[PDB]
Amino acid sequence: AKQSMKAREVKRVALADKYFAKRAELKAIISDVNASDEDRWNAVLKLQTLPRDSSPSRQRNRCRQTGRPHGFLRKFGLSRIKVREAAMRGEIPGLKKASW
């Protein structure tokens, strides 16, 4: 991928970690059902004011060696191509070609 794209992802991760607690609180007010209407309204507005990049749903898993946004594999953190290369070179523990 592009260096700018990787930089965007780093920024989003950093902001999500920074603002995680406040988002948790505000969503707790919103999805709480015994919270007053005024409380829920102000919580919606404050959650708006929080930056969008803070939303952990904004992130996109990328192959950590190439930044590729497609074909990701969470177990390994790499796309299919990089997983294949490392696995064949033996740089992945236990992994080996399956046949059954």
Binding site: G71, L73, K75, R80, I81, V83, R84, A87, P93, G94, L95, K96, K97, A98, S99, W100
Partner: protein
């Protein structure tokens, strides 16, 4: 009772590990119930191999997590320290439980 959970990526290595576990737990005097083989987790992955298109060209990889169980009923005072100082070979994760 002392519960030893051995997880490994290699059955030969984990068999070595559990063998020396039982040998240590028997030299210390305590009696052992095992080793018990718990089912291997065969985590399978499927990946396209061409960098572009070619959807029917795939590799299927597999990670076989082998797991063994060791039981130490009547845990001798020296047995506990021996097992906790034993320090297993790399490539094995050992979980100790009461």
């Amino acid at each position: 009772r002392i519960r030893i959970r051995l997880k490994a990526f290699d059955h030969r290595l984990i068999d070595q590990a559990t063998a020396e576990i039982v040998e240590t737990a028997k030299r210390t005097g305590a009696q052992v119930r095992g080793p018990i083989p718990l089912p291997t987790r065969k985590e399978r992955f499927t990946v396209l191999i061409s960098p572009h298109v070619n959807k029917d060209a795939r590799d299927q990889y597999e990670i076989r997590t082998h797991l063994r169980l060791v039981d130490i009923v009547e845990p001798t005072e020296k047995t506990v320290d021996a097992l906790m100082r034993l320090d297993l070979a790399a490539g094995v994760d050992v979980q100790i439980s009461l």
